[PDB]
Symmetry: C6
């Protein structure tokens, strides 16, 4: 990453490398893996972002889809900012430069700590997370329509499933079971989730 000591490059740590690999192995593309990726890639250069993605062993269908999303975003960067060199001067980053493909670490360090800074780490991380959210949604096994409360299912457990599915992807009342549904209609409109959950406790 780049961090303060002045902004300087620091090695990505064994802890960070390990953390990311393990979260992917344990959680796959569960929605909460996105904020974890983002946190572990704090201050990350494009080389670091590529390093973290490369260390993943499985899920190569997903990694391939991620490359496609990244390519799309790179072509849009080049559409918006066409790259136009003078000796010892900073060059303009194209799409592939931001994705760490055609840029060196020094060039990446140069853009990020420049004044004004060109945050190629954050621009790339945005493309990656955009791609990762597309995968999270695809790998979501259940539609929100299929999430309904079972006759003996505690209301809490049903809501946990409802917003879990919704995160990946008055309907809550519709899909509640008959008993709790009657209690919820009795509360009327403008009832908070807290009040609903207490009412069906």
């Amino acid at each position: 990453p780049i961090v303060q000591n002045q902004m300087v490059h620091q090695c990505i740590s064994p802890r960070t490398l390990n953390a990311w690999v393990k979260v992917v192995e344990e959680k796959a593309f569960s929605p909460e893996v996105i904020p974890m990726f983002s946190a572990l890639s704090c201050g990350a250069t494009p080389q670091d972002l590529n390093t973290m993605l490369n260390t993943v062993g499985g899920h190569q269908a997903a990694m391939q889809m991620l490359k496609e999303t990244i390519n799309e975003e790179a072509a849009e960067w080049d559409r918006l900012h066409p790259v136009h060199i003078a000796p010892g001067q900073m060059r303009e980053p194209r799409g592939s430069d931001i994705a760490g493909t055609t840029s060196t670490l020094q060039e990446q360090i140069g853009w990020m700590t420049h004044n004004p800074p060109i945050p190629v780490g954050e621009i790339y991380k945005r493309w990656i997370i955009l791609g990762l959210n597309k995968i999270v949604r695809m790998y979501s096994p259940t539609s929100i329509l299929d999430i309904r409360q079972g006759p003996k299912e505690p209301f809490r457990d049903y809501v946990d499933r409802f917003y879990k599915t919704l995160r990946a992807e008055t309907l809550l009342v519709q899909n509640a079971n008959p008993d709790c549904k009657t209690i919820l209609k009795a509360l009327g409109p403008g009832a908070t989730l807290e009040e609903m959950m207490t009412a069906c406790q």
Copy 2:
């Protein structure tokens, strides 16, 4: 977080990220998870507080209730402090800015290290903990009325349960079993818990 080096931003650590996720997985909304959250979010920016909350995989009914509490507190912040920009000047944080929704990391860094400082990390953490205490209370399985000492239950074990339930949520004497209750009445008023626990040992 923000810490001293001067106040500067530091990345949230893999240890901290991991610690929080594991405590939630192991303890759910047991009362003691609140002080742990608060300690792990020491010096935290709103982005950090959102990051920690986002990394939680389950409990989305609870996370939804937390958003509701946060919204309520945000509307009260905007009621108390209406946001009213001049070039290169610091803007006033509204409710959603404190919750990290409509504020950047730089703006957050700017408010927190300003002189005088606007501690948006602590103001937000207060809203979160307020919401988290509401959940702790809701998920408490047992009422204090139902906590009574069994005929062969050691008095210590009963008191452990009594104050455990009470933390989530002369009654102690009333709910004691006949044998220990007689010993406790014999001690009279103004007996400390220590003396009570020794008397029924």
Copy 3:
């Protein structure tokens, strides 16, 4: 904690938070948990001491007894030092201020690093350890009178039990078994534990 960088505040660490919670879970109120608590709370502010105590999940009968001891010590602090404010000046800490109840972190930082320093961290830690020793003694299952050497028990194992019990709470010779007791009387007075343990090997 407060440590040198100048004396400055540092966040309590995930390692420290975890260490304390695990020692309590594994050892409960075994005597050796007191020196571990004291070591893990090195340089601790009252907020830190409260944080460590709060993160404990079980043992709420004990935590309640601890509050009682702390209250007693707070009332004695207020008896000895009655608190008597001038703008931008340091105020005098009362009992509840030392216990972190009515004091902010800044006020705590202010007292501790002041010249001359008012060590509210150490004064509070003393009250806590005083309370913790009272609990260690209470939860000690065996009296030293009941610790006696079994007919086939190695003398070493018996002494391990004898001083273990004694830590929580020529008697050693009296409670030794007949065979080893005769050997010990033959050594006469002024025999060291080493010589006793060798003589009954």
Copy 4:
């Protein structure tokens, strides 16, 4: 490694040493072990690169092949840059010097931090990774021709295998099973992997 404090030598860490050894033990020469090696050897001297390779216990057929690749690259370095000494002056690194065989740590430190720098760590790491990719390819058990979708195999699982094999080493459509193949031909040309994977969901 060499890192900023000025560029200075730092010891390779127990965490780093352990990380590398464990990844090799768990993953052998799975493709993703290359980016992990590269990340763990960030800022590494030739001595460090040799240290990491030496700590590997098994896979000595592979380590021998790696030496061969390294020798080949060393002979090409000597072909391109023949080494031609003056007292207290820096000497020119030959092939074996870059590979850490005939160079001391001080000489390595000297080349790397020189102005202009001769990055012997990165030049050597390139030779090593070049050798490691040759092994990854050799130890790949399956040809991409043999990767075909089973009649009841989810399309996602088949693509995971397809790009996994391809990483080690409209064919994707050809090797799909009859049912999904018909759906894919119906999409026409220029369909993204995302659309293909959704179409066969």
Copy 5:
């Protein structure tokens, strides 16, 4: 401990605290626990040395013997250096001061960093290790006389046992079995252990 930043006090770490406790739990008073104790107590104050000893849960017979050895050494310190105060001046450390019993942390910090330094940490550690070696020897289960090579025991395994016992507490040839003994006598005098071990391989 005390370390360089100038010599300043640093908190004993959770890693260090944990390491010591675990080594004692796993190895008891195996000989190699002494050098581990010494390494973990590097730069340690008397308070730190007492902290490490206090955190040990079992082995209170041994800890009691350790106190006895320490007392003996303290009385010898007071015999050699009788303590003879002037305002704001450093006082002379007596036996109990070195053992951390009657000395504060500040006084300990004062002696250790004084010029010339009075290394009370090292003087105390010497008393402790002297006591610990006495225990290692006592808890050694086997005499070296009883260590003899079994008829089918590999010579290496026998020598491992021989020097293991010897560490706790031409004899090696005498106690070797008939077959290997004849081979060893054939080597003559002045044969190294290496040659002996090869000869009986």
Copy 6:
């Protein structure tokens, strides 16, 4: 160790202490334990090298052989450099001084950071590794002559064993099984291991 802050002494870490002890316990005197020892003892003083060796619990036959090798090297140091004191001046290190036996930590710190430096840490580490390689070779269970490819053994597995044995201690072709041997002779002379391994795949 000694490291840069200026060259200053730092405590050997719990991580480092633990790492070494565990590698010995898991790998004994497998060849790869030598480079691990060397890496973990980076910047080590003789006291540190002795500390690491002392913390090893088993293998006392080997540790004894190591002392013998060290003694031999010490006598050669004294043969080459006879030690010949002036107040407050640095003395000349003899054999036993380099081995940490008759030298203090301060004297060791003094030699190592002197200008010009006398690297007693590296000179001693060389003696130790020289001794450790002698043990690795001795404890190697299999001769390279006994390593031959089984009739159904994959060629890769055989080569792994061949160079494993060779590390501890056209022969590769001779010891290959009939089928693969014919393929290898057909390749002719000057075939690389890569080509051989592919040819017998």
